[PDB]
Amino acid sequence: DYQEALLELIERLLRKLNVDPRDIKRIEQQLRDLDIYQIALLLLIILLLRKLNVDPRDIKRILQQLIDLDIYQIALLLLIILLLHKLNVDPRDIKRILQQLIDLDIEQIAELLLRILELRKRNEDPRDIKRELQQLIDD
């Protein structure tokens, strides 16, 4: 069962992040209702936040918000935060940006990702890409 295997990796990561076991149980229960694409993408986002040294309680809170999104939203968010890390955006800023993106609808997120990619292709400076993304989010 590939879903169960992926769920066990998530449970292991949450334990290594000192997430309260009571919260792990409630999270695991919610994850068991998602499809395998959502579960795998959520695993990746956890791995990325862990790589950025995001505080465990913040990872837990962010995960709980992401569990309510569909595969398309979760995937596009992963790509955005991967690009922001590549551009050396401070993890504290990536965290705050991710919290804002979660409330946006899928069309806006897809448009933002395209915009970031367009600007990268145009050789725009990392700080300019961050500032423009932050401005488009506030809009």
Residue numbers in the entry: 2 to 140
Structure paper excerpt:
Here we describe a systematic approach to generating modular and rigid repeat protein oligomers with coincident C2 to C8 and superhelical symmetry axes that can be readily extended by repeat propagation. Repeat proteins are composed of an asymmetric structural motif that is concatenated several times in tandem within a single protein chain. From these building blocks, we demonstrate that a wide range of unbounded fibres can be systematically designed by introducing hydrophilic surface patches that force staggering of the monomers; the geometry of such fibres can be precisely tuned by varying the number of repeat units in the monomer and the placement of the hydrophilic patches. All multiplexes follow the naming convention CsHRN_Rr where s is the cyclic symmetry, HR stands for helical repeat, R is the number of repeats in a single chain and N is an index to differentiate between multiplexes of the same symmetry.
We determined the high-resolution structures of five designs from C2 to C6 symmetry by X-ray crystallography, cryogenic electron microscopy (cryoEM) or both. The crystal structure of C2HR1_4r matches the design model with an overall backbone alpha carbon (C-alpha) root mean square deviation (r.m.s.d.) of 1.54 Å. C2HR1_4r has a large repetitive interface composed primarily of leucines.
